[PDB]
Design a protein around this ligand. Structure first.
Ligand code: FES
Ligand code: FES
Ligand code: FES
Ligand SMILES: [Fe+2]
Ligand SMILES: [Fe+2]
Ligand SMILES: [Fe+2]
Lengths: 440, 440, 440
């Protein structure tokens, strides 16, 4: 136990974060508690498509405070190294990807994919003092993943369902988000939000519309939660009223430290997020859709490419800033707000969510938060993160390192009000990726 | 007395501000000395026209360091609350103005105009812990005023002449100014400025031109001052040479803490300012024109709408940034400067003044100021402000709280050089809003 | 000796800067060690052409941390004063250049070219307390130079070759550079760079192309250095392989504290730089071309005006920001990079160099530099600067104050591998501006 560990409840409501814990969770740079924790997991760096071909243009990428450079060498292996030449500090973005390496444009020093210095023109014997940081990589889901932690503790690469399926079952997008990773992830472990800001989007949008779940979601925002701790993270049982006999359970899966699997809408593709910290004020927000049984159709895949569903349209090509952003007021339409075609005045799943999270300021004011029951999932995920971060300081091994425990699924069920859903899911969600999808 | 109180004179010239006093007067945020002083007066928040209709789009407004949200409820009452949901800190700009309240777009918590939480979906019993800051409001002059101080010390709403007249006698505009409130207000208690930067504007401009005062103003920048302290603030007797027998007295009224009434030009409408701090580096600069006797004509009102006189044209619609600003060099025309159609090279009353005040940097370098005689009004207003601010710390009641003492007028008179103007004004400016305007 | 003085070598490689020395050299503002050192030399402020005519528009100029104003008075003398009115701190950019002075636009105070206050309307006796900083000036090379140091130590104005020649032998340009003066100057005392980033530019460009030096430069980046200390700065003997019998020596001249003369390419005009600190994060980079024997032709002069050679094309007219800059990715063409028409992917001498130096961040990370042999000149210039800066603190007189020692030239020679170049240059580079140019 460490003083920082906040109590779960205070005066009979859930308790907010104390100052130190606020910091433990938000500060992600090198040699921070959370910086060190996050380094132990495989990290999604960028998409394979951004560095498609060998000897192709390198791209700058910033993760967990460090500034890096991604490129694909001559053999075709995706590599990731530090952005800066060890010589006089110039950027290797201006260098030359060729002959299995990056060669600095200033004086010709060359580094390979592991950041080993392999040529120094003026001084061949200096190689060993010119090494820079290079990080191992693997490709899965159409994403380049990197391992940024101590060499001896590198785990098995992740085996989430969208990472194991064949390519054309899967579709991935990413968006830059002008806020700290925490508040953003917090948004996808809060199913009560869907009943308010998304109330009217849920009907027009092709990845969501025309399924029976919507009648129940629309008609009750008041979500009671049950939370079960597991080898991979948490399972979130979000209860709403079904019929008068019954309850609509949405079960979303939180896979520590930064993944969700969202409970389905009908036979529409399954959805998921990742959030990756760029610094303490920004993050990559990843969105994944995938179908377990058939390929994605063309009307599915194309709808995603146009930026419907949990995806977005971009400001300019290869921008990764959304079309709706803090410069155009996120497209606010007050007229639409009055006529009840949009709750917030903003259009689009993604925008409706990040508009609000950006508006909190880069880091949410944790001091001024006053929590409610709908925040049960959030509070527990915070504890798991804090206790892992603090535990790693003290030499404990962090949770969820074992990829085989990540073969799981979200779900929806209608159930009588006396049936216990945790028991139900013991029965039904064992070996869940072999069964079809539990849906409504 | 407090060490901060600077002496009025040093080595036979007027004395500049010491470091602490510099700070006492410029730092306007919550729980500062000047923050607390200013909170005791009614504060001009925004114009009624910006939130014209009920259930209409709320607007963000920042005053005295705090970030707020203004809107007009269903009954039609202008309200002003804190910008941020008490729940998880999201902006209420994205919420819903309806049924006498703002409802947060994220999870549906609703606040009324006094910032009382009136609905919590997930937890009806939590209402009392979810309150936010809400501030009483009143409408006068076409302006929404708010009272931001302790509840028990709220005074009578202000009774300045342009606040009591009927609407069509009055016209109000506001402009965003990229500098601290102090240096800006200081500019409208410095009538010597008019003889230099405005020398050539005073003739072309329809709210100023073709009156006899101009010959005397143009022909003498060297203004001797007499200052009389009063219940409402200060009276500023600015002396210039008239004929060889006489003196042209411009009497401007400074109404503590942040108002002026400017001495008239002819029968042209009367003019006035307010300056309101947004933060320590910016302020709203308000300009008011009004006619006591008749309505404003259409050529008057329209000229003001086009941005002549003490008003401005805007960069874009509903911007409140001026057409001439720090990005276009305030429109500088050096050719016009050489040909003596503009002193500074810049066109427009307002621009000619704020161009210079913005150029001092956000906060004037008080350490490096070397004062002259034309700065007599400035020095005294500084003392009144410092002594009120410091006195409030020590439990003294601040000046000018009583609205009835604000029924006053500015004036111009030609007078023989032996006649004392203070005596003159005892006689003539008693009950001044009942008489016509003393002018030239 | 002062602890700061770093050792020249560590573990058999050249040693990087310690923390304090890093600071000694980069911090250039008033009352810093390096601020004080640099003040003792004549400083290039701006070009004569920017303030061509008398009573012409003044221009803002920022040097060595101070913010100034340059203008040409009625007599025609270039003057330089502090930007700000001593009265209430307004900018004199808005004032009036006429009758041998600048008159403030606010209240009419006037200053002459030495910063003496010569008129105060409200108070003639106040003149002596209203003085501001004014700095003596002289014109040479088409540049206004100013002397910003104590009055009693003003030296003779500089007698560099391009300062003494007649106007039409000479051409000067300047560019704003988004980095500290040091790393930029460091770039022009590093001839090994030319073999890499400039490899392909050296052939297409009319101030460089079609001369025999290129074959030798292209074919060896591995530059051995010999450095000889002199009255004016350092002489840099950069050795590359010539034929198998011989060595191509490029001798560049570093004239303390911030000038270079670059070793020639053929009969193409001679080239030189200056770097002048604006603040700790930016600098003016000056480029000079000149021909000693004939005028510059029209195809020479015009090519320079179009921004070829060590000059640049600008973003907009009178901008001084380059066409290629940090906003357009410096024009990167990866296709050209692959097809070996550009090493870095960037086009243009100047851009190829400053792209890399800007990319280090405003101040190079001196802690993380790992030096190589090609950095011999850099290391020594750093010592000369540190020891002068530290010595001035202790009352020692700084080096290179004597203009007559600046009548020198750069050179290239092919030489047998047994001939010593320093001896060669004793013989040949005595009285070098009287001889023709040693070239290849
Ligand atoms: S900075 Fe990269 S090789 Fe010199
Ligand atoms: S943040 Fe406003 S109700 Fe949740
Ligand atoms: S500020 Fe320059 S004269 Fe008043
Ligand atoms: Fe959502
Ligand atoms: Fe004015
Ligand atoms: Fe170069």
């Amino acid at each position: 136990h460490h003083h920082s560990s906040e109590n779960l409840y205070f005066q009979g409501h859930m308790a907010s974060m104390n100052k130190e814990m606020s910091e433990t969770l938000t500060r992600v740079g090198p040699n921070t508690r959370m910086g060190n924790l996050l380094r132990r997991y495989w990290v999604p760096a960028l998409m394979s498509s951004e560095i498609a071909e060998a000897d192709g243009p390198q791209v700058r990428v910033q993760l967990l405070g460090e500034k890096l450079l991604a490129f694909r060498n001559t053999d075709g292996k995706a590599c990731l190294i530090s952005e800066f030449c060890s010589h006089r500090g110039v950027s290797l973005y201006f260098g030359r990807n060729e002959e299995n390496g990056i060669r600095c444009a200033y004086h010709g020093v060359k580094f390979d994919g592991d950041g080993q210095c392999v040529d120094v023109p003026s001084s061949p014997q200096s190689c060993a003092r010119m090494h820079i940081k290079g990080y191992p990589c693997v490709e899965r889901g159409g994403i380049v993943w990197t391992y940024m932690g101590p060499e001896e503790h590198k785990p098995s690469p992740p085996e989430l369902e969208w990472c194991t399926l064949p390519p054309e079952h899967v579709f991935v997008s990413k968006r830059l988000q002008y806020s700290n990773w925490l508040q953003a992830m917090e948004g996808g472990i809060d199913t009560a939000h869907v009943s308010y800001v998304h109330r009217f989007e849920v009907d027009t949008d092709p990845m969501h519309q025309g399924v029976k779940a919507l009648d129940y979601i629309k008609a009750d925002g008041n979500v009671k939660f049950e939370i079960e701790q597991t080898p991979f993270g948490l399972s979130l049982f979000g209860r709403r009223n079904g019929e008068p006999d019954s309850y609509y359970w949405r079960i979303t899966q939180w896979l520590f430290p930064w993944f969700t699997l969202i409970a389905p809408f009908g036979n529409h593709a399954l959805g998921g997020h990742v959030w990756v910290p760029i610094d303490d004020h920004n993050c990559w927000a990843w969105s994944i859709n995938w179908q377990p049984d058939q390929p994605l159709t063309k009307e599915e895949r194309q709808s995603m490419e146009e930026g419907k569903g949990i995806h977005v349209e971009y400001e300019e090509p290869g921008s990764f800033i959304p079309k709706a952003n803090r410069n155009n007021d996120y497209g606010m339409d007050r007229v639409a707000q009055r006529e009840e075609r949009s709750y917030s005045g903003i259009f689009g799943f993604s925008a409706q969510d990040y508009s609000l999270q950006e508006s909190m300021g880069p880091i949410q004011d944790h001091a001024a938060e006053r929590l409610l029951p709908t925040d049960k999932a959030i509070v527990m995920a915070r504890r798991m993160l804090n206790e892992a971060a603090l535990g790693l300081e003290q030499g404990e091994t962090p949770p969820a390192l074992d990829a085989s425990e990540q073969h799981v699924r979200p779900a929806g069920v209608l159930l009588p009000r006396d049936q216990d859903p945790v028991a139900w899911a013991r029965e039904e969600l064992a070996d869940a990726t072999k069964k079809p999808v539990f849906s409504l």
